[PDB]
Amino acid sequence: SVTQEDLKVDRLPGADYPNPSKKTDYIMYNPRPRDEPSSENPVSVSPLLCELAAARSRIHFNPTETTIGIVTCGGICPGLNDVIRSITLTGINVYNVKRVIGFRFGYWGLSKKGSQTAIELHRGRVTNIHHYGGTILGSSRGPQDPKEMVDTLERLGVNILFTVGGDGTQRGALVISQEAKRRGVDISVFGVPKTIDNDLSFSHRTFGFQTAVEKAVQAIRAAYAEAVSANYGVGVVKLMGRDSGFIAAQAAVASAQANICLVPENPISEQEVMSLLERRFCHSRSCVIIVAEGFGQDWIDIGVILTEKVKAFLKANKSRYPDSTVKYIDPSYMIRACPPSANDALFCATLATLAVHEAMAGATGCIIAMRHNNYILVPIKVATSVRRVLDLRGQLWRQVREITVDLGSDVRLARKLEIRRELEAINRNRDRLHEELAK
Amino acid sequence: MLNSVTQEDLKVDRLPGADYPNPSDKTDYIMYNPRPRDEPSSENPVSVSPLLCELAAARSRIHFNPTETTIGIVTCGGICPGLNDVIRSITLTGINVYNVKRVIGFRFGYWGLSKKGSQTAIELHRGRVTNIHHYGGTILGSSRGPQDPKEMVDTLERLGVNILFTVGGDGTQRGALVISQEAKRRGVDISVFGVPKTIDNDLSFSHRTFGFQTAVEKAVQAIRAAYAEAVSANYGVGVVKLMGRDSGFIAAQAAVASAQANICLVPENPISEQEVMSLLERRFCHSRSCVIIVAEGFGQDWGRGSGGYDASGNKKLIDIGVILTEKVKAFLKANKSRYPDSTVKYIDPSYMIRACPPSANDALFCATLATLAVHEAMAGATGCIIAMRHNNYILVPIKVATSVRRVLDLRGQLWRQVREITVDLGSDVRLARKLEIRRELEAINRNRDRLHEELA
Amino acid sequence: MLNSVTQEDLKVDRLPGADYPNPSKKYSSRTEFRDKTDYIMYNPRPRDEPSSENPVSVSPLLCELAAARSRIHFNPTETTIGIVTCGGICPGLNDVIRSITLTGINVYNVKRVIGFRFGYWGLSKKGSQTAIELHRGRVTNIHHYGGTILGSSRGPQDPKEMVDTLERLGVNILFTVGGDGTQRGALVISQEAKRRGVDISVFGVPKTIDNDLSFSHRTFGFQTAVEKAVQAIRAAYAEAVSANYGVGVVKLMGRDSGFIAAQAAVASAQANICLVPENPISEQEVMSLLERRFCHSRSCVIIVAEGFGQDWYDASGNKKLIDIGVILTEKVKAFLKANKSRYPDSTVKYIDPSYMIRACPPSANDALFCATLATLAVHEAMAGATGCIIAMRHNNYILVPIKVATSVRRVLDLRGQLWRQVREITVDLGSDVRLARKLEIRRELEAINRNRDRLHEELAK
Amino acid sequence: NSVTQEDLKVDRLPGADYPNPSKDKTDYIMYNPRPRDEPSSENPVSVSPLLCELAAARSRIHFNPTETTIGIVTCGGICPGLNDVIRSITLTGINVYNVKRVIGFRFGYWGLSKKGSQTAIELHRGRVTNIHHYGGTILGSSRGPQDPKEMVDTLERLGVNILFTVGGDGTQRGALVISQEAKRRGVDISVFGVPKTIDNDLSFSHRTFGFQTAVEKAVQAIRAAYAEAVSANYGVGVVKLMGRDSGFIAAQAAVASAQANICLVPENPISEQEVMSLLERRFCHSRSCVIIVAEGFGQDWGDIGVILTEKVKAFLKANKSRYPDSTVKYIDPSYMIRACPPSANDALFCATLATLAVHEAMAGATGCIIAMRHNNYILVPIKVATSVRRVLDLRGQLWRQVREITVDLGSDVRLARKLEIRRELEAINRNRDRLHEEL
Numbered sequence A: 001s002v003t004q005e006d007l008k009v010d011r012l013p014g015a016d017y018p019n020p021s022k023k024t025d026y027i028m029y030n031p032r033p034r035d036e037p038s039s040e041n042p043v044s045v046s047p048l049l050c051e052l053a054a055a056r057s058r059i060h061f062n063p064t065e066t067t068i069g070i071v072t073c074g075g076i077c078p079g080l081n082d083v084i085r086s087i088t089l090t091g092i093n094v095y096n097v098k099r100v101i102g103f104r105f106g107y108w109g110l111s112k113k114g115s116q117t118a119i120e121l122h123r124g125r126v127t128n129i130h131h132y133g134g135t136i137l138g139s140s141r142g143p144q145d146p147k148e149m150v151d152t153l154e155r156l157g158v159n160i161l162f163t164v165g166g167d168g169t170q171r172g173a174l175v176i177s178q179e180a181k182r183r184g185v186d187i188s189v190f191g192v193p194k195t196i197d198n199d200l201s202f203s204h205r206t207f208g209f210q211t212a213v214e215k216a217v218q219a220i221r222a223a224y225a226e227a228v229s230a231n232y233g234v235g236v237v238k239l240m241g242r243d244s245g246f247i248a249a250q251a252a253v254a255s256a257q258a259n260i261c262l263v264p265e266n267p268i269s270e271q272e273v274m275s276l277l278e279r280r281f282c283h284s285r286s287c288v289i290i291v292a293e294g295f296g297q298d299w300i301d302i303g304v305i306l307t308e309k310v311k312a313f314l315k316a317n318k319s320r321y322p323d324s325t326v327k328y329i330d331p332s333y334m335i336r337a338c339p340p341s342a343n344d345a346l347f348c349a350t351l352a353t354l355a356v357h358e359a360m361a362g363a364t365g366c367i368i369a370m371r372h373n374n375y376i377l378v379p380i381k382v383a384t385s386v387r388r389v390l391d392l393r394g395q396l397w398r399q400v401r402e403i404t405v406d407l408g409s410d411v412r413l414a415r416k417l418e419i420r421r422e423l424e425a426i427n428r429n430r431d432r433l434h435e436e437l438a439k
Numbered sequence B: 001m002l003n004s005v006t007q008e009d010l011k012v013d014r015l016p017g018a019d020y021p022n023p024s025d026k027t028d029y030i031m032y033n034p035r036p037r038d039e040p041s042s043e044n045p046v047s048v049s050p051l052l053c054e055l056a057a058a059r060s061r062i063h064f065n066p067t068e069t070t071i072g073i074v075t076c077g078g079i080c081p082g083l084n085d086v087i088r089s090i091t092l093t094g095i096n097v098y099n100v101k102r103v104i105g106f107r108f109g110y111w112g113l114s115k116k117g118s119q120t121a122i123e124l125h126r127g128r129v130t131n132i133h134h135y136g137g138t139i140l141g142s143s144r145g146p147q148d149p150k151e152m153v154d155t156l157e158r159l160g161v162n163i164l165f166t167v168g169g170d171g172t173q174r175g176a177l178v179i180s181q182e183a184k185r186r187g188v189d190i191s192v193f194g195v196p197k198t199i200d201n202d203l204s205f206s207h208r209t210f211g212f213q214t215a216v217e218k219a220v221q222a223i224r225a226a227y228a229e230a231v232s233a234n235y236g237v238g239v240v241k242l243m244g245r246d247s248g249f250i251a252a253q254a255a256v257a258s259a260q261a262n263i264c265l266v267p268e269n270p271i272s273e274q275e276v277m278s279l280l281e282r283r284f285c286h287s288r289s290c291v292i293i294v295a296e297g298f299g300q301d302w303g304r305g306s307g308g309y310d311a312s313g314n315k316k317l318i319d320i321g322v323i324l325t326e327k328v329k330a331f332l333k334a335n336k337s338r339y340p341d342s343t344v345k346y347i348d349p350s351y352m353i354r355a356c357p358p359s360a361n362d363a364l365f366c367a368t369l370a371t372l373a374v375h376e377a378m379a380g381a382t383g384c385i386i387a388m389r390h391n392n393y394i395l396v397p398i399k400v401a402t403s404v405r406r407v408l409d410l411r412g413q414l415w416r417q418v419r420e421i422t423v424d425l426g427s428d429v430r431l432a433r434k435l436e437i438r439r440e441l442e443a444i445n446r447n448r449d450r451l452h453e454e455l456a
Numbered sequence C: 001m002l003n004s005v006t007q008e009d010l011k012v013d014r015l016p017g018a019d020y021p022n023p024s025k026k027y028s029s030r031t032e033f034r035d036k037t038d039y040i041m042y043n044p045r046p047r048d049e050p051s052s053e054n055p056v057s058v059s060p061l062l063c064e065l066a067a068a069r070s071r072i073h074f075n076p077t078e079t080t081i082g083i084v085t086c087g088g089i090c091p092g093l094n095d096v097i098r099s100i101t102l103t104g105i106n107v108y109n110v111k112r113v114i115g116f117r118f119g120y121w122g123l124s125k126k127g128s129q130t131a132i133e134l135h136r137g138r139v140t141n142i143h144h145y146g147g148t149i150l151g152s153s154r155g156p157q158d159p160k161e162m163v164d165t166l167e168r169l170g171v172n173i174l175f176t177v178g179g180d181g182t183q184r185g186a187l188v189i190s191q192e193a194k195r196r197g198v199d200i201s202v203f204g205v206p207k208t209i210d211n212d213l214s215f216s217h218r219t220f221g222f223q224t225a226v227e228k229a230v231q232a233i234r235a236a237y238a239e240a241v242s243a244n245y246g247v248g249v250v251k252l253m254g255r256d257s258g259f260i261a262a263q264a265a266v267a268s269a270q271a272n273i274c275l276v277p278e279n280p281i282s283e284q285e286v287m288s289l290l291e292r293r294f295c296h297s298r299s300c301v302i303i304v305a306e307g308f309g310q311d312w313y314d315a316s317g318n319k320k321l322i323d324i325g326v327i328l329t330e331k332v333k334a335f336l337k338a339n340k341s342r343y344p345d346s347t348v349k350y351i352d353p354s355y356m357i358r359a360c361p362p363s364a365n366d367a368l369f370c371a372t373l374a375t376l377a378v379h380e381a382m383a384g385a386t387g388c389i390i391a392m393r394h395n396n397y398i399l400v401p402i403k404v405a406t407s408v409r410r411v412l413d414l415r416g417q418l419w420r421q422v423r424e425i426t427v428d429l430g431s432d433v434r435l436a437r438k439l440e441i442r443r444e445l446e447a448i449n450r451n452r453d454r455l456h457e458e459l460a461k
Numbered sequence D: 001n002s003v004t005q006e007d008l009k010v011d012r013l014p015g016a017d018y019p020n021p022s023k024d025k026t027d028y029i030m031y032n033p034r035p036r037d038e039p040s041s042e043n044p045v046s047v048s049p050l051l052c053e054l055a056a057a058r059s060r061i062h063f064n065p066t067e068t069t070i071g072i073v074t075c076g077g078i079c080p081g082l083n084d085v086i087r088s089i090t091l092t093g094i095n096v097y098n099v100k101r102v103i104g105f106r107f108g109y110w111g112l113s114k115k116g117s118q119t120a121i122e123l124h125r126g127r128v129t130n131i132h133h134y135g136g137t138i139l140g141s142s143r144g145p146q147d148p149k150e151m152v153d154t155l156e157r158l159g160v161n162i163l164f165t166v167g168g169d170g171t172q173r174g175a176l177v178i179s180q181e182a183k184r185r186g187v188d189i190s191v192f193g194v195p196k197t198i199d200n201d202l203s204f205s206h207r208t209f210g211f212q213t214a215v216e217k218a219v220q221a222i223r224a225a226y227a228e229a230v231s232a233n234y235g236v237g238v239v240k241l242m243g244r245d246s247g248f249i250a251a252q253a254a255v256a257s258a259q260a261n262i263c264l265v266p267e268n269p270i271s272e273q274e275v276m277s278l279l280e281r282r283f284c285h286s287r288s289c290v291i292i293v294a295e296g297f298g299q300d301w302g303d304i305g306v307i308l309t310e311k312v313k314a315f316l317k318a319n320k321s322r323y324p325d326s327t328v329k330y331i332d333p334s335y336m337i338r339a340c341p342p343s344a345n346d347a348l349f350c351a352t353l354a355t356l357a358v359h360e361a362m363a364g365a366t367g368c369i370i371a372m373r374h375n376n377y378i379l380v381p382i383k384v385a386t387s388v389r390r391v392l393d394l395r396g397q398l399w400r401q402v403r404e405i406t407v408d409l410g411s412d413v414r415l416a417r418k419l420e421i422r423r424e425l426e427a428i429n430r431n432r433d434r435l436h437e438e439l
């Protein structure tokens, strides 16, 4: 029940200035056809069209009179400094805006007390900041009074505010937008979605996620080495994922080293987990367990709890697992806090520049997202009403099930054929050697 | 001239019969162009294009009896980060999912299937592929050049190979469909299925090929080094050659990602030696360093090649890397007048970009392409490649795939980002510089006061 | 209570007889005569100033130098080599396994090489079943991966039962890769062996990431471990500077010494408090360092060694660990919560990168070091050395009897250059906070105002 | 060989009339800590009469800290760590000694000429904060001398009291000439060398800054060459690994990588014909060959990198007969080895060298370098330091490890190969039975 109206992104009234550098075009939400190939063109399975992001010929704000505002909120995420850098440099080099302000430590930065700390963003101040993790502005969780914030925006003459944060941040962003139009102030509030878990809807990718999976795989390589080094060794790795398991699932498949992958979308029992572990220890002396922070909220720190419960299980069963070892790893610090991969640096730069192009063109109350290889605008209202989750019947989760322990699979039948294939390889290698001597 | 892709061109071949169940359902499609003809209205939107692409997926009925099927793998041409992943995934998907009788790896490209190289061919089991994705190159090995299709299909028949995966560029797949035709010519049950290898990401009906994301990571590293060398010298010039035989996707993305390129030379934008030197000259107006990205395919009109081909059917190119470096030196030497001491370092990181293991993102992509390749080949697909487009995996007949290629849009967002960073002759040098200073003073004088405040 | 190490204590045992020539190092390849033991001075500092006579060591001790010998004890083609890895993994174990295996096979051409699985358990009659054959194929690339292909356990086994296995498999040399506890057991295997008059060499390759072996300036894995520590700190630093009154607590190995903590702290240049066992301070002292940091900064990074503050059952029924990382984090939180007054919003992130520091493959420099230690270990064990470790000291490879090696341990000198560099970077209650800060500013203004004018110059002219 | 204790006596400027703001006689370390006689009841005596002055912070210092200007110049090829040395000299000066001012001279000795003295930079805490995170030198670097007269004019003009010269043998040679020109006019100047040489060929040294980082990169270059080469039938990777006059990088990289089959260093000059017979022997029972070559090898040949590659190609052409398809890839990773930031171990080493350099220069040391030898930091007069150089011992343990890995013309090809096979069969046939057992 998402309607075309839900996808209509707001514009501030008027586009009375030319673009210093450079029709709304659309892309289909679902590019799959209703009917088979035929004489006429195919029609979408969905009625939804998404507004494409692009530099416009006419823009709302007089560039040389425009102040741009930036705020970063919530958990850090690889790429924040890139988004800060790109918004700042696109503003200055392309549109030549009067001023760019950075609000310190999240929404607190726009409160009358934190407005003191706000920083001037020039070319010099952002030159290399993309080389470092975190945010030069700083970040806090938690809202402020939208009234008090819009006072600061009016006071500093801020014309556009970029809100870099999760669902909660944009929810607040739309409330600033509405508080602004309620006074009839000329303010654009534009969201750059920050979410390492890539669980934004009307999106296939958010900045930081690809970088985060790189680090997750590194964490798993370490866990794997620890675990295979012990007799009945268990590496438990916690891989982000508050409400979705996209990092857990991709890391599990990429690493090719996960035997059990625990995600919120597939909530199983403590007892079920231990029988997967038990089946792994039938024909293996090590087990790597990926666990999303959001798994087993009905069992909070699932990392420590799963580790304690695995230990308890192995201790109860010393009988069969005589010496055992269980190492817990929390690489959260290492996954959020790094600078982005080159690919994520480019993605961040592209999101930020299109964000400025569209905000200057008077877009407001929207996020910028990337979907079907294209950059789209999405109203915050819809963006924050629905969220993304693993499809347990889809290709990614199928690849997790192919690698992870499955109680279905005949373990010892599967192993018979394994051996026959290996003998067939050995016996050929055996003869080719024999040949070389006499020959 | 317009290309003439028709829906018939996109219909991928199937070997006749799907008479066995899947150990582990109609063809679904995705629209080639998901942009609508008309604005939002009462009815659902309709594609600007009539073309539909076949989606890749595991099928319920399959052509080959899994337990009786031999899978063959061959890797051809320049190495590319991910080849071992594709080898590993084809091997493990075959064994763990379909439980195929045997998997053969053909050594050193098509040479591996010639009666001479068929000696060297290797048995691929789980043990033999366990960790091969951790290393660059190909455990099979790779050569440029075709062999006698007759002699190759002899080997395929001799070893009872039922599917052959061809991992290589346009030339390799062109040969793949020639194996397919030589096979049907004898009425043998063979699938020939392509996994596109091209680091330049210039396959059409594709937004991404395996290895490209990894290659851009390395290019940016090469640039970071060049940048350090160049900024260290007074009138220092780093020239970096970044792959790109016929397209500049690596050059362009590396240039934007690095944010350290001042001149980015790609084949799509052929400019003169004289134009390049005036970009350099303008850089040295208000800077003592310049980094120059150059695609191996740029400036094919700057010199004349021998006129020959390498064995794969690529033009033997004029080493534009060495030539651009010599011409920059010549220019700086002619103008010692204004560039009194100058330094020009040339860097060729080709070795480092192809030869590395894949990024985790490229490991996943390779693994996904390879498994869908096996799912579809088992379902009797043949004479096609697997590609990724609009976030989805599609099948494409080799015939169309090898008749069109991909190239930078000089009016598109990526190239716009290159032009925002690289030197622009347009902006009036010394006016442009006045405002630069005023902005920097305005920053300094604020920093100046905020300090003063803290004391009193 | 002084240590009582005499020159006799540094004489390393040799099994009686060196009755075979060296396959690789021929006696006729040298310039000078005699295949004797050469020595290096324990302490190369002189008693007296420069004078007419040569200088004399401040110490009487000489250490035996490690090197390939012209005569060897074991008949190479009849020799079985045994390898066992014990305790915490450490970057480089697979290199040491690989190098011992390949030096044995390629240089001496030994009959066979056995890998004992999961520590000393591998030599017990039960674990002797699991022992692996080590050939060229089985070790080709194992140095590319962290951990140990043999596996590792803590804990001793019955020396009697172990030497049964060594005799049963015809093992002539056993390399013991492990910490102090492992070598202590190694010497006990050696003595149990000589007690039956079996022809066995027991030779230690010291494993200790903390680099706290004595008669040593470097153990394999330590350089790699400091690389990872600095990476962990970069992350903690980013988390911390991102929060208003942000605190990164990083635990950096160091059971009984703080060499990783100290080097990481200096290298990173990002540590404001560095807590090592050698400098035991109070909870109250720590909080006043933090307090002084928050006078003129909104972030603090705290390095803490596992072994710091030893004087400071989980729900599932297991005994809960000595974990200064969790405790320091709780106590910092408690302090910040008591003082919300002045630190209104605060954040404390704890990082335990132990997993990431031990479990990685070695740096190229540590790969070389591992390869060198392992090959000299084989050269010397073949030359009949036993009851000793191989160590690296004053840029040279030496042999040390296990007895001495396990009676003394290494520790930070709090008056030495490394710890001085930590004190220069970390918060110091000495420097008067607000005067120190005045001059900071004046220096920055003096820089700004010059930059300011040089710009002004360019414009109109 | 003929080096005297007088040669090792390091100069001090007359007077140490001020206390140390942070923190006493000269201590020494034995040049050669090997004993003359066997172990005995008394302490052993050095084989050598030579003692080196140990570097350390002193209680009395020559320069009045608050009146002292420090000068820094970086010369010749960049080297991983230059920015660390710049940073540490600057911060040790400011934070420990509290010096009046610190100047950075741009683009080498040219920076001190009356023309380049214009470009010289003021170095404060802000200007050096993160410069160690980047390769190259924020000061810049040129080769070549300037008029020592003209340079000492600049030093007098800017009131420079200490000048740190970061560069190779040629740079320090010039440094001592500045020192002598300074004392020749009544100028209170310390000239103190921080040796820069990636090849680690400084004498009275076991390690120079950048060398450990450079070997890390060399091994990475080799891993790439190896992958290219093993991918081709009769594949040849030629890698050039620095080494103008010594092969320490070539040798360590070769051993560390374990992937070099031929390692060509200046210390072991062999013929083109000798190289090709190593290659020939490799291709008897192998289809790939990796060749490490130091830039200083074969200066008596036909840019040894391009020439060796051409000569290998020429050899493979019309031996097509036996090497039917062949491939020869040349790699020059010089750019990548010099231009990177230092390893954490090299960052620490750089920081340590720079701080001790300031401690000792403040204590009036001059006409000397700081070096690291037998795990200790020593001072060495430039005069001796630049009169002798370091090179591979072909009879030492490092080169022995290169010979163990690289192809050896000694071992009888076909007999050597028989035993290879027997060992492999003995492995295969055991693996073969253990499998059979399970069925």
Ligand SMILES: CN(C)CCn1ccc2c(ccn2Cc2ccc(Cl)c(Cl)c2)c1=O
Pocket (backbone or CB within 6 Å): A165, A166, A167, A168, A170, A191, A192, A193, A194, A195, A199, A200, A201, A243, A367, A380, A383, A384, A385, A386, A387, A388
């Ligand atoms: C209650 N809320 C604070 C946490 C749970 N959650 C998590 C994700 C989520 C919603 C609603 C939408 N989404 C997806 C999402 C993620 C990031 C952004 Cl920036 C946006 Cl606008 C939407 C959501 O409600």
Ligand SMILES: CN(C)CCn1ccc2c(ccn2Cc2ccc(Cl)c(Cl)c2)c1=O
Pocket (backbone or CB within 6 Å): B168, B169, B170, B171, B173, B195, B196, B197, B198, B202, B203, B204, B246, B312, B313, B314, B385, B398, B401, B402, B403, B404, B405, B406
């Ligand atoms: C003659 N050929 C050997 C070199 C020139 N070339 C280069 C690229 C190219 C074509 C035709 C299509 N393409 C793009 C491309 C890239 C990779 C693959 Cl696997 C395919 Cl099928 C097509 C093409 O003809």
Ligand SMILES: CN(C)CCn1ccc2c(ccn2Cc2ccc(Cl)c(Cl)c2)c1=O
Pocket (backbone or CB within 6 Å): C178, C179, C180, C181, C183, C204, C205, C206, C207, C208, C212, C213, C214, C256, C389, C402, C405, C406, C407, C408, C409, C410
């Ligand atoms: C009891 N032990 C398990 C922990 C305390 N400890 C720590 C270090 C240590 C000793 C005795 C000597 N050493 C230094 C050391 C480190 C590594 C090795 Cl392999 C050796 Cl032989 C000695 C020592 O007793």
Ligand SMILES: CN(C)CCn1ccc2c(ccn2Cc2ccc(Cl)c(Cl)c2)c1=O
Pocket (backbone or CB within 6 Å): D167, D168, D169, D170, D172, D194, D195, D196, D197, D201, D202, D203, D245, D369, D382, D385, D386, D387, D388, D389, D390
């Ligand atoms: C002429 N020179 C530029 C090249 C040859 N060369 C190479 C090394 C060398 C000398 C003399 C001494 N050394 C070793 C060395 C290396 C670096 C430094 Cl900074 C010093 Cl003082 C000495 C030497 O003469």
